[PDB]
Amino acid sequence: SKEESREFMAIFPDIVRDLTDHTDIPEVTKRFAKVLQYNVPTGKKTRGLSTVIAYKMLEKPENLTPENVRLAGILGWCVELLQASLLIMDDLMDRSETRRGQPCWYRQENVGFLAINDCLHVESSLYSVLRKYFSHLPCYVPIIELFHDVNFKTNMGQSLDALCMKDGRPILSQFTMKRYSSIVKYKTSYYTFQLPVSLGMYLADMYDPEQHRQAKTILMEIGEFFQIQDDFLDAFGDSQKVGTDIKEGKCSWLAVVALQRSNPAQRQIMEEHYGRPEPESTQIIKNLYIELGLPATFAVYEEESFNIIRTHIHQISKGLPHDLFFKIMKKIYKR
Amino acid sequence: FSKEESREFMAIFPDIVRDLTDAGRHTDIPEVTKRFAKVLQYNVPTGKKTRGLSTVIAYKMLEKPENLTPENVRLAGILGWCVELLQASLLIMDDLMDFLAINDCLHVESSLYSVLRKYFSHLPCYVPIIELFHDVNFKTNMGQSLDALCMKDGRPILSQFTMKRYSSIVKYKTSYYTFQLPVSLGMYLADMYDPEQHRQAKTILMEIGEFFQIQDDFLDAFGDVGTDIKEGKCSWLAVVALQRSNPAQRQIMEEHYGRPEPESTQIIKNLYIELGLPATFAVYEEESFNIIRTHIHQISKGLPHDLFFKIMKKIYK
Ligand SMILES: CC(C)=CCC/C(C)=C/COP(=O)(O)OP(=O)(O)O
Ligand SMILES: [Mg+2]
Ligand SMILES: [Mg+2]
Ligand SMILES: [Mg+2]
Ligand SMILES: [Mg+2]
Ligand SMILES: [Mg+2]
């Protein structure tokens, strides 16, 4: 929606002023404004806007004042602040060149390993936003605790992902569906799906831990498909982002399923060519994925997962609106 | 710190590891949980825990003697370990910039907020304590960045080396988390929330923090192995050297400060000797001590002066 997107984007400049406008150190506050302006407001803002929409479908229609919708928007920007911090750090860790076409922050002149500090700074900053706007509301402490908990869980996700690599070479014996599912849950699903919905619920004064647990069950399932679809399109999606999962030696759903279905000779091709810099090595792995019928396998998974998740949504108890979870399903599966 | 204080503090650490690495919960990710136990065990509990133990001492000297139960002194010890978790994340980040992964510093920092939630979420001091940690984290990061703005393309920017910028770096990068945080935590646990009491403490603790770092800066070059010169750090010695330098002495700093060759380090030290930085530190040490002793004696708003004298005596020796 034009009105929702514009109202949301209009909040960002206020959050920069809140965090940067410490009058004795103007040179660092000016630099932090640039850190925020480069890394936080560019691209889709899907997680941020999903927080606003989640709130709009959870709150009683009589309580949906512009004031409250703005508070939802500020929570959305706190999600985008958390993500910005995570992606600054991940880019340094993965030594990536670009993110969404933009050169990675750490590559910019006179940053490098100072990106570590900028990561921590950006993550810490969202708690200052929460204090200014929410310190007087009952949802304050639950929201602070949710952000700190999700940060901790995301770090477990990132560390689990790193235990699939040694000396910058993939450990293919680690590429199991159980480890993949755990990586997606902790590294992606909590901050991408649980965080926006739980923020919406808290702002709507929904504190029942069972309601949050029932939301989690369905959101972790949708989250798994989301990342599996993302992994699939990296290799088989119409380029005209250019996919580099194979070169980077990522524990992707494609690599996991490839190893499940491979005969010994096919396993040897993964051992020899997976996570190598040569473009020839990327094409050999892609050719193996085609040979193992991974496009057909994804097509079956997409149809089956959709049906299973839709069934689980129909069985949701409590005051949780099924509407919200069907709406999330629609945007992800695009149907 | 007394034997009993030290031993009962150290005894808390294994509990905090079990609390954070999910002992009792039966986790779906044991491999990475076991790794985090090792990150904590290897990086957090080793050497002197002076910030952690200072939090316990601060609480013991602010709380009414009747309220000093083993249970409350243990809580003070847990706040102390949260300061040591912050210290550990900051040290990891310094090790990285010069087994451990890059996100371990973010993880360790995040873990202190899990410890705070577990032990303090139902106490009145909860919101003030988490807000103090949030604010100190932010300020420490600002200090870290201000320090980095004294360096461009691997070279020190000597025009940035002013006493104004140095004082700001020490205040934001070190003094807030090293001196303000332990005392304010003690005060909050003792249900002392009055902003004027906190501001009275801050004034003295920012002054102690400045001597602490200036003494550290001095001993790096003139102690009995320091690499501040080689690393081109914005140290008190370099700041004062540039204040006192004639144009020829400035050119020696321009040419030889922040160079890897050990000969450049000895040239800078020779220049520091020539500029009378030892004598200058001796004057600063005497004058700062007399000013800080004065302010501690003048401390009001119902604060005990003996807490701050103990901190002062530990730093100045
Ligand atoms: C604790 C931290 C730092 C978490 C990082 C979370 C994250 C979404 C990383 C990107 O994943 P990726 O590296 O597998 O993919 P890409 O970089 O291509 O988006
Ligand atoms: Mg990564
Ligand atoms: Mg990456
Ligand atoms: Mg990428
Ligand atoms: Mg991807
Ligand atoms: Mg030093």
XYZ file of C-alpha atoms and ligand atoms in Angstrom:
676
model
C 0.000 0.000 0.000
C 1.340 3.477 -1.078
C 0.013 5.135 2.168
C 1.552 2.442 4.506
C 4.997 2.508 2.710
C 5.240 6.376 2.689
C 4.053 6.748 6.365
C 6.695 4.082 7.333
C 9.617 5.642 5.307
C 8.750 9.110 6.824
C 9.715 7.762 10.350
C 13.403 6.933 9.451
C 14.792 10.550 9.449
C 13.303 11.167 12.985
C 15.079 7.968 14.285
C 18.447 9.261 12.847
C 17.898 12.665 14.626
C 16.896 10.766 17.858
C 20.257 8.833 17.745
C 22.629 11.577 16.340
C 20.986 14.957 17.319
C 26.552 14.021 22.929
C 27.227 17.656 21.774
C 30.945 17.403 22.883
C 31.630 14.756 20.102
C 29.890 16.065 16.914
C 32.400 14.309 14.530
C 31.328 10.741 15.669
C 27.539 11.582 15.798
C 27.801 12.911 12.167
C 29.651 9.650 11.203
C 26.928 7.494 12.922
C 24.197 9.356 10.905
C 26.115 8.174 7.742
C 26.415 4.559 9.130
C 22.567 4.559 9.623
C 21.802 6.377 6.281
C 23.982 3.923 4.194
C 22.923 0.597 5.830
C 19.305 0.946 7.197
C 16.822 2.759 4.837
C 17.696 1.401 1.297
C 15.773 -1.488 -0.398
C 12.403 -3.145 0.433
C 12.031 -2.869 4.303
C 9.758 -6.013 4.177
C 10.376 -6.992 7.881
C 9.760 -3.368 9.068
C 6.463 -2.982 7.095
C 5.347 -6.555 8.121
C 5.530 -5.355 11.801
C 3.007 -2.520 10.954
C 0.677 -4.935 8.996
C 0.942 -7.624 11.772
C -0.124 -4.935 14.358
C -3.030 -3.707 12.098
C -4.456 -7.309 11.912
C -3.974 -8.008 15.708
C -5.198 -4.673 17.267
C -8.973 -3.956 17.707
C -10.011 -1.631 14.802
C -11.084 1.120 17.336
C -7.466 1.291 18.738
C -5.855 1.742 15.231
C -5.066 5.498 15.681
C -2.357 7.145 13.491
C -0.370 7.530 16.806
C -0.410 3.698 17.412
C 0.329 2.845 13.696
C 3.389 5.207 14.000
C 4.508 3.260 17.167
C 4.231 0.020 15.058
C 6.369 1.766 12.354
C 9.056 2.683 14.982
C 9.127 -1.033 16.100
C 9.475 -1.947 12.365
C 12.540 0.374 12.069
C 14.027 -1.278 15.246
C 13.748 -4.651 13.341
C 15.491 -2.973 10.312
C 18.197 -1.577 12.719
C 18.782 -5.160 14.080
C 18.988 -6.592 10.491
C 21.332 -3.728 9.344
C 23.689 -4.611 12.294
C 23.565 -8.387 11.415
C 24.256 -7.799 7.649
C 27.155 -5.292 8.301
C 28.840 -8.051 10.430
C 27.919 -10.992 8.096
C 29.400 -9.132 5.038
C 32.756 -8.702 6.930
C 32.614 -12.413 8.058
C 31.813 -13.693 4.482
C 34.169 -11.063 2.855
C 31.258 -10.283 0.411
C 31.713 -7.484 -2.223
C 28.076 -6.167 -2.470
C 24.622 -6.480 -0.782
C 21.569 -5.548 -2.996
C 24.099 -4.035 -5.506
C 25.546 -1.586 -2.882
C 29.225 -2.112 -1.892
C 29.349 -3.766 1.615
C 29.914 -1.177 4.434
C 33.240 -2.810 5.591
C 34.737 -2.314 2.035
C 34.151 1.533 2.186
C 37.398 3.573 2.717
C 38.657 3.642 6.388
C 36.047 1.126 7.765
C 37.330 -2.499 7.333
C 37.272 -4.302 10.749
C 35.765 -1.081 12.329
C 32.499 -2.566 10.849
C 32.527 -4.833 14.001
C 32.132 -1.671 16.196
C 29.500 -0.220 13.754
C 27.556 -3.570 13.958
C 27.479 -3.388 17.830
C 26.703 0.406 17.705
C 23.718 -0.014 15.260
C 22.315 -2.995 17.314
C 22.701 -1.027 20.628
C 20.970 2.059 19.047
C 17.490 0.373 18.699
C 17.272 0.106 22.566
C 17.666 3.966 22.710
C 14.736 4.258 20.190
C 12.631 1.822 22.349
C 13.410 3.900 25.525
C 12.363 7.261 23.918
C 8.990 6.039 22.471
C 7.902 3.006 24.645
C 9.389 3.490 28.216
C 5.916 4.725 29.445
C 3.923 1.752 27.912
C 3.248 -1.738 29.412
C 4.805 -3.492 26.308
C 8.248 -1.798 26.985
C 9.972 -4.663 28.944
C 8.508 -7.575 26.851
C 9.752 -5.794 23.627
C 13.300 -5.105 25.079
C 13.482 -8.790 26.233
C 12.224 -10.030 22.776
C 14.961 -7.979 20.946
C 17.793 -9.196 23.310
C 16.531 -12.854 23.105
C 16.255 -12.751 19.235
C 19.809 -11.196 19.029
C 21.162 -14.130 21.187
C 19.246 -16.785 19.105
C 20.409 -15.191 15.766
C 24.066 -15.381 17.023
C 23.549 -19.154 17.764
C 22.210 -19.441 14.157
C 25.292 -17.640 12.675
C 27.753 -19.751 14.810
C 25.945 -23.024 13.790
C 26.274 -21.911 10.091
C 30.066 -21.297 10.632
C 30.473 -24.902 12.026
C 29.689 -26.083 8.406
C 33.013 -24.444 7.201
C 36.739 -24.982 8.147
C 39.734 -23.008 6.667
C 37.188 -21.490 4.184
C 36.264 -24.996 2.818
C 32.791 -26.599 3.289
C 32.524 -29.652 5.663
C 29.973 -31.679 3.580
C 29.501 -34.286 6.425
C 27.839 -31.352 8.361
C 25.323 -30.712 5.465
C 22.320 -32.624 7.003
C 18.612 -31.533 6.823
C 18.534 -31.472 10.699
C 21.491 -28.970 10.875
C 20.048 -26.956 7.887
C 16.592 -26.673 9.617
C 18.343 -25.512 12.869
C 20.446 -22.871 10.953
C 17.296 -21.462 9.178
C 15.282 -21.420 12.489
C 17.940 -19.594 14.617
C 19.789 -17.459 11.967
C 16.753 -16.285 9.845
C 13.242 -17.276 11.112
C 13.308 -15.674 14.650
C 14.308 -12.128 13.437
C 12.466 -12.361 10.017
C 9.074 -13.933 11.056
C 8.729 -14.301 14.909
C 10.117 -10.796 15.784
C 7.687 -8.730 13.581
C 4.576 -10.791 14.675
C 5.531 -10.870 18.436
C 6.167 -7.043 18.312
C 2.662 -6.593 16.758
C 1.136 -8.834 19.504
C 2.962 -6.966 22.376
C 1.923 -3.482 21.025
C -1.696 -4.892 20.896
C -1.234 -5.919 24.625
C -1.265 -9.702 23.793
C 1.100 -11.209 26.467
C -0.253 -14.848 26.654
C 2.876 -17.059 26.143
C 0.651 -19.795 24.508
C -0.515 -17.298 21.778
C 3.219 -16.487 21.102
C 4.048 -20.280 21.092
C 1.197 -21.057 18.576
C 2.369 -18.134 16.330
C 6.007 -19.469 16.547
C 4.986 -23.042 15.423
C 3.409 -21.733 12.124
C 5.971 -18.870 11.560
C 8.976 -21.310 11.893
C 7.326 -23.571 9.196
C 6.673 -20.591 6.792
C 10.248 -19.389 7.610
C 11.719 -22.785 6.528
C 9.913 -22.674 3.096
C 10.940 -18.964 2.680
C 14.696 -19.826 3.020
C 14.388 -23.096 0.947
C 12.689 -21.042 -1.874
C 15.473 -18.370 -1.497
C 18.157 -21.157 -1.690
C 16.418 -22.653 -4.817
C 16.131 -19.288 -6.703
C 19.864 -18.529 -5.999
C 20.695 -21.339 -8.541
C 17.504 -21.619 -10.728
C 15.928 -18.089 -10.485
C 15.903 -15.722 -13.535
C 19.019 -13.480 -12.971
C 17.634 -10.779 -15.387
C 20.700 -10.547 -8.079
C 23.394 -13.039 -9.353
C 23.524 -16.116 -7.023
C 26.910 -16.978 -5.370
C 25.795 -19.628 -2.750
C 27.817 -22.392 -4.596
C 31.081 -20.295 -4.815
C 30.692 -19.264 -1.096
C 30.201 -22.977 -0.124
C 26.942 -22.254 1.815
C 24.945 -25.040 3.574
C 21.973 -24.406 1.175
C 18.869 -26.682 0.828
C 20.149 -27.535 -2.739
C 23.571 -28.764 -1.383
C 21.844 -30.733 1.485
C 19.296 -32.488 -0.851
C 22.062 -32.998 -3.514
C 24.149 -34.989 -0.922
C 21.035 -37.039 0.164
C 20.345 -38.099 -3.498
C 24.002 -38.345 -4.789
C 25.686 -41.706 -5.623
C 29.414 -41.935 -4.613
C 30.648 -40.469 -7.994
C 28.199 -37.494 -7.586
C 29.323 -37.016 -3.898
C 32.964 -36.803 -5.243
C 31.867 -33.902 -7.591
C 30.515 -31.986 -4.498
C 33.726 -32.809 -2.464
C 35.946 -31.526 -5.359
C 33.954 -28.519 -6.754
C 31.559 -27.148 -4.014
C 32.662 -23.784 -2.484
C 35.427 -23.129 -5.109
C 36.098 -19.687 -6.706
C 36.391 -20.863 -10.401
C 33.240 -20.178 -12.524
C 33.719 -23.707 -14.087
C 33.274 -25.231 -10.544
C 29.967 -23.271 -10.010
C 28.640 -24.605 -13.395
C 29.642 -28.272 -12.555
C 27.633 -28.088 -9.232
C 24.672 -26.394 -11.075
C 24.845 -29.196 -13.749
C 24.815 -31.837 -10.916
C 21.734 -30.104 -9.308
C 19.970 -30.362 -12.754
C 21.118 -34.046 -13.125
C 19.797 -34.954 -9.587
C 16.356 -33.431 -10.518
C 16.400 -30.752 -7.738
C 13.939 -28.493 -9.683
C 11.379 -31.409 -9.648
C 12.167 -32.046 -5.903
C 11.590 -28.317 -4.995
C 8.280 -28.309 -7.014
C 6.966 -31.302 -4.919
C 8.186 -29.665 -1.623
C 6.515 -26.282 -2.534
C 3.074 -27.961 -3.176
C 3.298 -30.315 -0.100
C 4.669 -27.678 2.398
C 1.905 -25.169 1.319
C -0.868 -27.787 2.001
C 0.655 -28.933 5.386
C 1.129 -25.279 6.623
C -2.444 -24.244 5.500
C -3.809 -27.279 7.501
C -1.771 -26.170 10.610
C -3.157 -22.543 10.316
C -6.801 -23.895 10.301
C -6.012 -25.695 13.659
C -4.654 -22.480 15.400
C -6.467 -21.868 18.776
C -6.854 -18.732 21.034
C -7.797 -15.236 19.682
C -5.069 -15.469 16.942
C -6.576 -14.316 13.593
C -6.018 -17.013 10.867
C -6.267 -14.022 8.404
C -2.709 -12.803 9.365
C -1.029 -16.247 8.814
C -2.870 -16.832 5.449
C -1.766 -13.272 4.391
C 1.916 -14.126 5.291
C 1.578 -17.490 3.382
C 0.225 -15.575 0.291
C 3.201 -13.097 0.088
C 5.849 -15.887 0.628
C 4.395 -18.594 -1.740
C 3.096 -15.733 -4.042
C -0.410 -17.339 -4.448
C 39.638 -7.330 47.541
C 39.380 -9.867 50.464
C 39.790 -13.696 50.038
C 36.076 -14.360 50.921
C 34.840 -11.611 48.474
C 37.067 -12.966 45.606
C 36.187 -16.698 46.127
C 32.369 -16.148 46.494
C 32.479 -13.929 43.301
C 34.451 -16.527 41.197
C 32.015 -19.271 42.428
C 29.169 -17.504 40.449
C 30.848 -17.859 36.975
C 30.117 -21.619 36.414
C 26.377 -20.952 37.217
C 26.238 -18.097 34.587
C 27.762 -20.490 31.934
C 25.071 -23.166 32.746
C 22.312 -20.437 32.700
C 23.473 -19.239 29.202
C 24.352 -22.695 27.679
C 20.876 -24.036 28.517
C 21.768 -26.652 31.229
C 18.266 -27.978 32.207
C 16.424 -26.951 28.962
C 17.527 -29.893 26.656
C 18.331 -27.900 23.444
C 17.933 -28.807 19.700
C 21.407 -27.186 18.995
C 23.862 -28.778 21.515
C 26.966 -28.530 19.181
C 26.816 -24.651 19.011
C 25.648 -24.349 22.705
C 28.768 -26.366 23.822
C 30.907 -24.026 21.608
C 29.432 -20.907 23.369
C 30.320 -22.444 26.814
C 33.987 -22.590 25.583
C 33.776 -18.962 24.200
C 32.664 -17.819 27.735
C 35.046 -20.128 29.747
C 38.123 -19.157 27.607
C 37.503 -15.328 27.391
C 35.487 -14.167 30.509
C 36.807 -15.571 33.866
C 40.670 -15.269 33.497
C 43.024 -12.637 35.067
C 41.898 -9.833 37.470
C 38.069 -9.219 37.545
C 38.545 -5.704 39.071
C 35.389 -4.192 37.379
C 33.278 -7.223 38.491
C 34.626 -7.202 42.104
C 34.296 -3.334 42.207
C 30.496 -3.785 41.553
C 30.283 -6.086 44.669
C 32.415 -3.653 46.821
C 30.320 -0.632 45.602
C 27.034 -2.424 46.599
C 28.475 -3.587 50.001
C 29.420 0.072 50.881
C 26.131 1.706 49.586
C 23.528 -0.828 50.943
C 22.324 -0.619 54.610
C 24.384 -3.237 56.569
C 21.073 -4.969 57.641
C 20.157 -5.595 53.918
C 23.578 -7.274 53.161
C 22.349 -10.930 52.972
C 24.377 -13.617 51.107
C 21.463 -13.560 48.534
C 21.813 -9.757 47.834
C 25.692 -9.902 47.768
C 25.355 -12.815 45.234
C 23.045 -10.597 43.035
C 25.764 -7.846 43.211
C 28.272 -10.542 42.048
C 25.978 -11.393 39.058
C 25.840 -7.650 38.045
C 29.687 -7.715 38.345
C 29.866 -10.700 35.897
C 27.536 -8.757 33.482
C 30.227 -5.952 33.522
C 32.883 -8.695 32.870
C 30.731 -10.114 29.967
C 30.732 -6.524 28.493
C 34.552 -6.248 29.137
C 35.065 -9.698 27.432
C 33.032 -8.648 24.294
C 35.151 -5.409 24.048
C 38.470 -7.376 24.453
C 37.320 -9.966 21.799
C 36.549 -7.034 19.375
C 40.107 -5.599 19.974
C 41.693 -9.095 19.425
C 39.664 -9.392 16.131
C 40.628 -5.874 14.812
C 44.301 -6.961 15.442
C 38.962 -20.497 17.303
C 37.129 -17.163 18.077
C 34.708 -15.867 15.352
C 33.750 -12.193 14.600
C 30.110 -12.545 15.913
C 31.366 -14.006 19.283
C 31.851 -10.351 20.479
C 28.151 -9.580 19.590
C 27.013 -12.929 21.192
C 28.978 -12.426 24.499
C 27.645 -8.795 24.764
C 24.047 -10.070 24.071
C 24.442 -12.805 26.791
C 24.681 -10.230 29.687
C 21.044 -9.143 28.875
C 19.922 -12.835 29.285
C 21.671 -12.924 32.745
C 19.944 -9.587 33.717
C 16.479 -10.937 32.634
C 16.996 -14.258 34.540
C 18.067 -12.699 37.904
C 16.603 -9.103 38.000
C 13.374 -9.038 35.824
C 11.088 -9.057 38.966
C 13.166 -6.525 41.045
C 12.492 -2.726 41.043
C 16.116 -2.019 39.835
C 15.508 -3.987 36.541
C 14.588 -1.147 34.074
C 17.214 1.350 35.422
C 19.920 -1.434 35.202
C 19.112 -2.595 31.582
C 18.783 1.123 30.510
C 22.240 1.840 32.121
C 23.802 -1.109 30.143
C 22.019 0.053 26.891
C 23.348 3.653 27.392
C 26.942 2.551 28.368
C 27.058 0.087 25.370
C 26.064 2.965 22.974
C 28.540 5.459 24.619
C 31.416 2.851 24.560
C 30.795 2.286 20.777
C 30.869 6.137 20.265
C 34.250 6.223 22.113
C 35.570 3.290 19.989
C 34.628 5.240 16.762
C 36.107 8.580 18.069
C 39.417 6.664 18.713
C 39.316 5.312 15.076
C 38.826 8.919 13.700
C 42.466 9.620 14.886
C 43.650 7.104 12.169
C 43.341 7.322 8.305
C 44.918 4.964 5.667
C 46.959 3.167 8.415
C 48.559 6.506 9.565
C 47.827 8.598 12.709
C 46.226 12.068 12.024
C 48.363 14.149 14.484
C 46.112 17.264 13.912
C 43.311 15.194 15.644
C 45.561 14.603 18.761
C 44.098 17.411 20.999
C 43.540 17.100 24.814
C 39.802 17.858 24.122
C 39.499 14.773 21.796
C 41.713 12.621 24.148
C 39.468 13.453 27.197
C 36.361 12.544 25.065
C 37.934 9.183 23.921
C 38.831 8.213 27.570
C 35.345 9.326 28.860
C 33.288 7.418 26.192
C 35.581 4.416 25.342
C 36.713 3.490 28.932
C 35.396 5.612 31.886
C 31.597 4.930 31.445
C 31.900 1.066 31.416
C 35.013 0.811 33.731
C 34.105 3.327 36.541
C 30.478 4.680 36.155
C 28.869 1.251 35.380
C 30.102 -0.727 38.474
C 29.127 2.111 40.947
C 25.714 2.952 39.303
C 24.902 -0.845 39.327
C 25.755 -0.984 43.091
C 23.570 2.142 43.682
C 20.599 0.707 41.646
C 20.759 -2.697 43.492
C 20.780 -0.613 46.766
C 17.526 1.063 45.439
C 19.360 4.446 45.014
C 17.598 5.947 41.910
C 18.064 9.748 42.596
C 19.696 11.194 39.410
C 21.669 13.791 41.515
C 23.326 10.907 43.508
C 24.307 9.229 40.155
C 25.552 12.615 38.733
C 27.573 13.302 41.984
C 29.236 9.834 41.547
C 29.840 10.385 37.752
C 31.754 13.718 38.317
C 34.391 11.998 40.579
C 34.441 8.682 38.576
C 35.101 10.509 35.212
C 38.083 12.314 36.934
C 39.472 8.970 38.330
C 38.898 7.377 34.863
C 41.022 10.126 33.207
C 44.004 9.668 35.632
C 43.649 5.833 35.224
C 44.134 6.019 31.394
C 46.831 8.814 31.536
C 48.816 6.656 34.078
C 48.324 3.587 31.768
C 49.450 5.735 28.751
C 52.589 6.910 30.704
C 53.582 3.355 31.879
C 53.184 2.016 28.258
C 56.379 3.998 27.314
C 58.161 4.498 30.721
C 57.103 1.290 32.603
C 59.635 -1.541 33.305
C 55.795 -4.455 26.623
C 54.076 -1.257 25.309
C 53.221 -0.762 21.572
C 51.134 2.514 21.761
C 53.851 4.365 19.697
C 54.065 1.550 17.037
C 50.191 1.396 16.818
C 49.938 5.250 16.519
C 47.457 5.444 19.474
C 46.037 8.848 20.607
C 47.869 8.524 24.002
C 48.320 11.341 26.610
C 52.123 11.218 25.837
C 51.595 11.917 22.061
C 48.932 14.635 22.845
C 51.243 16.447 25.377
C 54.343 15.896 23.105
C 52.566 17.841 20.262
C 51.483 20.651 22.720
C 55.166 21.129 23.820
C 56.907 20.450 20.421
C 58.754 23.152 18.395
C 58.326 22.725 14.579
C 61.438 20.405 14.348
C 60.114 18.131 17.194
C 56.634 18.069 15.474
C 58.344 16.790 12.235
C 59.970 13.907 14.275
C 56.385 12.936 15.431
C 55.001 13.385 11.830
C 57.779 11.092 10.428
C 58.186 8.415 13.188
C 54.836 8.107 15.143
C 52.800 4.943 14.280
C 55.664 3.185 12.357
C 56.375 -0.595 12.637
C 60.248 -0.306 12.809
C 61.459 -0.548 16.471
C 64.007 2.296 15.749
C 61.014 4.706 15.207
C 59.611 3.689 18.679
C 63.011 4.537 20.351
C 63.212 7.934 18.461
C 59.672 8.860 19.753
C 60.650 7.738 23.335
C 63.907 9.833 23.071
C 61.725 12.852 22.001
C 59.285 12.192 24.949
C 62.363 12.201 27.304
C 63.696 15.421 25.604
C 60.228 17.126 25.985
C 60.201 16.344 29.780
C 57.027 14.158 29.657
C 58.185 12.199 32.783
C 58.404 15.490 34.822
C 55.056 16.640 33.234
C 53.321 13.348 34.318
C 54.794 13.745 37.882
C 53.192 17.277 38.093
C 49.831 15.997 36.642
C 49.818 12.949 39.046
C 50.304 15.199 42.160
C 47.790 17.923 41.031
C 45.074 15.431 39.810
C 45.411 13.398 43.098
C 44.895 16.590 45.235
C 41.858 17.702 43.075
C 40.262 14.166 43.212
C 40.912 13.769 47.016
C 39.260 17.248 47.474
C 36.138 16.308 45.373
C 35.812 12.901 47.225
C 35.933 14.719 50.656
C 33.279 17.181 49.260
C 30.968 14.296 48.053
C 27.345 14.899 49.277
C 23.760 13.714 48.376
C 24.146 11.030 51.139
C 27.043 9.176 49.351
C 29.836 7.456 51.371
C 33.273 9.091 50.646
C 35.141 5.856 51.727
C 33.852 3.956 48.593
C 35.502 6.595 46.301
C 38.714 6.810 48.468
C 39.071 2.980 48.066
C 38.762 3.363 44.213
C 41.196 6.381 44.225
C 43.806 4.514 46.406
C 43.600 1.366 44.149
C 44.287 3.513 40.983
C 47.005 5.882 42.427
C 48.550 3.129 44.708
C 24.861 -13.032 14.064
C 24.841 -12.695 12.603
C 26.028 -11.899 12.141
C 23.862 -13.082 11.798
C 23.774 -12.976 10.305
C 22.358 -13.197 9.789
C 22.182 -13.199 8.293
C 20.775 -12.943 7.837
C 23.197 -13.428 7.460
C 23.127 -13.644 5.974
O 23.171 -15.043 5.687
P 24.212 -15.615 4.602
O 25.575 -15.079 4.885
O 24.046 -17.098 4.543
O 23.655 -14.977 3.237
P 23.854 -13.585 2.430
O 25.048 -12.887 3.032
O 24.081 -13.977 0.988
O 22.569 -12.809 2.624
Mg 26.983 -15.839 6.309
Mg 26.641 -13.614 3.703
Mg 24.844 -12.961 -0.669
Mg 20.151 -16.637 -0.433
Mg 47.195 1.058 27.302
